[PDB]
Amino acid sequence: LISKKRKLVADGVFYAELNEFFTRELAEEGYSGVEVRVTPTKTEVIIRATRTQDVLGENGRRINELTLLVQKRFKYAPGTIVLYAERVQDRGLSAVAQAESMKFKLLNGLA
Amino acid sequence: NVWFSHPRRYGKGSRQCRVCSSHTGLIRKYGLNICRQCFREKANDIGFNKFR
Amino acid sequence: MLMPKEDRNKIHQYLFQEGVVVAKADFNQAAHEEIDTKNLYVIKALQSLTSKGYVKTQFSWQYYYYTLTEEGVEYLREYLNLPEHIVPGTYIQ
Amino acid sequence: AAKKAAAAAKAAAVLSYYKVDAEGKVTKLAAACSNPTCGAGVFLANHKDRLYCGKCHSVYKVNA
Amino acid sequence: QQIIKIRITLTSTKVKQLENVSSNIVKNAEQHNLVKKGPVRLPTKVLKISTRKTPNGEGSKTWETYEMRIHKRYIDLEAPVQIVKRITQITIEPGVDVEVVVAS
RNA sequence: AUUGACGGAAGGGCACCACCAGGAGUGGAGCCUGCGGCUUAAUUUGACUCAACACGGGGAAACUCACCAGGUCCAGACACAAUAAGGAUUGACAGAUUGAGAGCUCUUUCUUGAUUUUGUGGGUGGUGGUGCAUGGCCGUUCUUAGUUGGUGGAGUGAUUUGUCUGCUUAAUUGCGAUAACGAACGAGACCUUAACCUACUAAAUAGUGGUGCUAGCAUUUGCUGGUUAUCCACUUCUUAGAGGGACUAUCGGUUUCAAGCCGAUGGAAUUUGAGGCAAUAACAGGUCUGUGAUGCCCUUAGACGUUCUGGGCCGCACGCGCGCUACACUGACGGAGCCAGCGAGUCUAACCUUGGCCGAGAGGUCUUGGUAAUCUUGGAAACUCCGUCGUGCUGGGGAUAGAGCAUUGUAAUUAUUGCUCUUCAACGAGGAAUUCCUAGUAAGCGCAAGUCAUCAGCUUGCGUUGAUUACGUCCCUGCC
């Protein structure tokens, strides 16, 4: 129970740990952001990302890794948290990615 | 054990940033409890586009 | 660091198990969420396990994220004497 | 001014501060701190007027 | 057949999903023909956090005013335990909160 | 020879941080604080042309806290060797000792129980230094107009115009002139709020009539009420969601009849007003005194680490800024009218407090409501009222003082504030200076928040009364 102000804030700030935690670990996967949803059942996070064939986990453990963090950090019953990653359709014009494709190009030993 | 932690509830040292963990600059304004250089930073995302 | 043979055993336990632990930088706490093992404990015994690679830390937001290591979870298989059936949250479609 | 050097973790290297009898019975001497912790063993040590107990850090006050 | 006078209370950050939901609302309910009102439309709260721009006194005195403008929005709706539930389940969505502060 | 730059050389723009046209002032004083400095137990510390001067949200009686004048206890991890259950060591009465009911010490000799103590190895306490070892942010050039690149095309090339003579704007904002064609960022678009919707959508946490119940004056049916339900019906109002709506519009001029600019009509309505985001390159501006962001030096128990006390940053012949009341009858005193808007607020406990009493008063309290469009909370001051004061430094001025009485606070002393009554200090419109300002704008009368236990002569935000003066220049400065 919180004052609507009080809610739509922490609800934005939610985009300030998935936006991050993915920043750093998924610095590889193609990090493609995310839709944080509510639906009357779940809280579902669709990871767009440009390499679903190391994120998916050699069967479904690497996806039961990033949830069973997203659950223990943010409290959720077990179920109220399914990660669908989803490719990234229109790759030429992400901005962020073609930057992550310099950082990855430079490191790798280039001029 | 009095003899390793002090009477830190109210003031500045008690509460500390979310993101960096600093005392310097604070945004209390709305369950926010960040710093008052970072904020802005992300934020534009977080909710706080602008409208000016 | 000098710990305890009923907290050293207890960690390396919801570490294998869920497999995956997410224990803040607040030294100075009775107690960590899901493990009675004060906080401060973990953090430091895990700075140890990481250090070898029976595990793998990731940082930021201020929590230390950890999460298993594909194998290094075959060390915990001989430490807390247990099967060589299961893989731990690991195979769960 | 001055450093200590930490107290020595010192060497009674054996023990037997528990009537070793001759032949075939062992019993238990200097009481055994009259508490449950303090269980059956606890060989009480002798200090100023009141006696001294370590299963509880040390503590306990029962004369001798 | 037990009747209940529900009250529908919405809020978002986009005037475009939101208006969408009392068009869908009050015409996925006049299909049902329900005894209701029309999307009441509540004073626009609207937070302006002054902050300086610089990272360091230095540097002119160089300031900001970012804010969330919600559009608060509510509704009405009668109907038993059956045809407020088939309505609350349906509008289903991105951006938005629905309460059902029930009036039994 | 080249432009990133430089000139106290010429030629153009742009802004009341630059002048006109002017208003209210600062600089004068009675006093607020803050920075110079002498003082000192110590008078901690950053900050010094626009970019240091009620500024680190610095409103500090402890504390905070960095200055001392002094008391302690370590809150010395980890390994090694040494003391070695024959006690490593711990603790304490009270008295000697001191602020003291610190066993700080020493007197005693109880207690104490391998957790300590000692060196060796090493760490981690650090508002101690270094902002020029740096991070991150924020000031400045900036209420800026400005960058840069392709393909052409030009011109060993450092490369160039493209980014321009002119007219145009709040504006590299746009027509137009053009071996230059067409794009990116800035600006603008966009987001906030203030206006408008007698159309929608709903409201015993907003108000209408009708309805009684009803309390007065009239009696003329009328007029004045009281009623969180007597009922309902409403939704202008008041809230607030969707939504819409303005584009300089319509003629008329005015011009290269281009971009633009006046004026009058309709209109709610100088970029609709206003903020906020704010490229390009930076500055050795500031900051390790916001940090458990942090290099490298130093500190490591006679510590610069921590903590109980007391004073200290509030000390004055004085120098410099930011500010409050006043030199009046266009005011000071008083009855009697008597009016908003931004807030806030108690939960695990004392935030707002009425009401009804007690107090001249300051207040005390019983008790009340209120996690708030639901309570205190619809009653704030400039003012209209009706006058006393009569040109008397007053009946403008309210300085500095003597006591009491209160209201907080372990501490009220270098009286935190308040009241109760008297002491009745300058100054009789503020020199060389020098600011800020084009519309609900300049300025004054308030108050709610930010401190907070309190103590505002500051910071922020609002409205209630509300005009002069232009609505233009490059004389200046300043920068392009």
Side-chain angles (χ1 to χ4, degrees), chain A, chain B, chain C residues 1-89, chain D, chain E:
Chain A
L1 188 267
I2 5 177
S3 198
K4 267 90 165 271
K5 305 198 190 259
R6 284 168 57 267
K7 166 64 78 69
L8 283 303
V9 160
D11 276 23
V13 188
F14 210 44
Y15 224 108
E17 240 149 283
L18 299 260
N19 198 320
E20 276 241 342
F21 187 49
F22 290 122
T23 305
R24 303 175 185 273
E25 180 157 309
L26 294 200
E28 301 202 321
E29 270 154 90
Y31 208 86
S32 337
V34 92
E35 73 192 55
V36 65
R37 322 179 199 76
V38 55
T39 45
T41 307
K42 303 259 219 299
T43 286
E44 312 164 51
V45 210
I46 292 76
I47 324 309
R48 2 67 110 188
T50 158
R51 199 181 312 169
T52 61
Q53 199 85 9
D54 317 343
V55 180
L56 85 309
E58 53 271 327
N59 71 57
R61 180 163 40 200
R62 207 270 153 79
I63 277 302
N64 293 29
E65 248 176 22
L66 321 182
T67 42
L68 268 171
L69 301 329
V70 169
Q71 196 191 291
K72 283 193 195 301
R73 197 271 152 289
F74 301 88
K75 317 186 180 190
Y76 301 94
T80 165
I81 211 307
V82 179
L83 274 28
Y84 279 110
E86 277 177 18
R87 276 265 195 240
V88 71
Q89 70 89 63
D90 304 24
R91 104 100 147 204
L93 57 135
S94 186
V96 171
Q98 288 300 326
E100 210 109 301
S101 186
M102 267 285 287
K103 195 182 264 273
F104 212 30
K105 265 193 161 61
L106 293 198
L107 298 198
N108 230 236
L110 240 175
Chain B
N1 292 236
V2 77
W3 28 228
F4 194 89
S5 276
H6 106 90
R8 289 161 286 187
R9 294 187 290 276
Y10 48 95
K12 300 154 189 302
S14 309
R15 88 192 100 119
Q16 62 98 53
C17 160
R18 79 176 90 171
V19 174
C20 27
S21 72
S22 172
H23 341 247
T24 114
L26 213 283
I27 304 298
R28 186 166 83 109
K29 194 155 194 277
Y30 285 121
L32 269 190
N33 279 322
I34 340 295
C35 87
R36 85 99 203 114
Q37 259 51 293
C38 182
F39 164 79
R40 277 171 69 75
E41 270 179 14
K42 305 265 191 135
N44 141 241
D45 183 27
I46 252 180
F48 310 97
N49 311 108
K50 149 255 281 192
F51 245 118
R52 316 92 175 79
Chain C
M1 200 207 180
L2 68 102
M3 88 288 280
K5 202 93 257 295
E6 199 181 69
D7 300 340
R8 185 54 160 286
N9 300 340
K10 91 129 84 76
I11 289 317
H12 306 128
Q13 192 181 4
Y14 326 80
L15 147 61
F16 207 79
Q17 175 61 51
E18 180 52 54
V20 184
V21 75
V22 239
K24 225 141 301 219
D26 187 63
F27 338 136
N28 282 21
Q29 280 195 6
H32 155 89
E33 312 90 286
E34 223 205 355
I35 353 276
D36 180 40
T37 341
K38 193 183 168 63
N39 213 20
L40 180 276
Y41 289 137
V42 204
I43 305 154
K44 302 261 89 204
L46 266 299
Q47 197 174 207
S48 166
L49 195 45
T50 41
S51 199
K52 61 266 219 74
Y54 295 116
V55 100
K56 59 151 292 303
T57 304
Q58 218 302 327
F59 195 83
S60 196
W61 320 328
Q62 309 303 137
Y63 311 120
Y64 312 69
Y65 283 96
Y66 292 100
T67 313
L68 67 296
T69 294
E70 311 309 302
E71 36 97 311
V73 306
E74 207 99 323
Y75 144 59
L76 258 297
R77 180 83 47 73
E78 277 268 28
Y79 189 88
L80 216 304
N81 5 254
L82 65 94
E84 283 264 27
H85 180 225
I86 68 249
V87 242
Chain D
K3 312 201 66 152
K4 323 299 183 201
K10 58 154 80 267
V14 273
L15 55 296
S16 300
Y17 171 39
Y18 68 88
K19 201 78 203 80
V20 34
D21 273 318
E23 205 256 304
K25 114 199 298 156
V26 162
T27 41
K28 305 189 272 182
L29 201 268
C33 205
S34 41
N35 269 292
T37 340
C38 304
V42 284
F43 329 108
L44 243 42
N46 219 302
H47 302 66
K48 190 79 201 158
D49 212 34
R50 94 295 192 191
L51 219 55
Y52 253 18
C53 173
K55 199 70 158 181
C56 36
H57 46 116
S58 22
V59 83
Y60 300 116
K61 295 180 173 184
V62 204
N63 24 39
Chain E
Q1 65 156 76
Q2 35 257 55
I3 292 157
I4 45 178
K5 286 117 272 170
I6 266 63
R7 200 185 86 175
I8 323 147
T9 315
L10 291 147
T11 165
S12 194
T13 98
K14 342 206 74 47
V15 205
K16 229 307 184 183
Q17 265 73 36
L18 189 274
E19 268 282 28
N20 146 88
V21 179
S22 181
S23 59
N24 190 302
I25 308 306
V26 86
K27 215 70 221 189
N28 210 323
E30 254 75 297
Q31 160 215 26
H32 284 292
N33 293 302
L34 29 156
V35 44
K36 64 89 202 77
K37 307 291 165 180
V40 170
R41 192 159 45 188
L42 283 75
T44 183
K45 55 181 205 189
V46 179
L47 44 165
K48 51 221 150 133
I49 312 170
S50 211
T51 49
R52 295 165 48 191
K53 298 200 170 207
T54 117
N56 76 284
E58 149 77 85
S60 180
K61 316 262 192 71
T62 320
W63 296 33
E64 196 71 44
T65 179
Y66 307 109
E67 68 181 318
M68 163 217 313
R69 306 112 107 276
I70 297 95
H71 300 266
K72 206 146 81 86
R73 196 107 323 168
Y74 56 94
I75 350 163
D76 186 280
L77 22 159
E78 285 172 16
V81 73
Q82 131 172 115
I83 208 79
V84 296
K85 143 202 287 204
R86 179 180 141 281
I87 228 297
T88 64
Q89 48 103 21
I90 189 77
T91 44
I92 302 86
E93 212 62 85
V96 180
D97 347 54
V98 170
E99 231 230 60
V100 188
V101 47
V102 175
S104 314

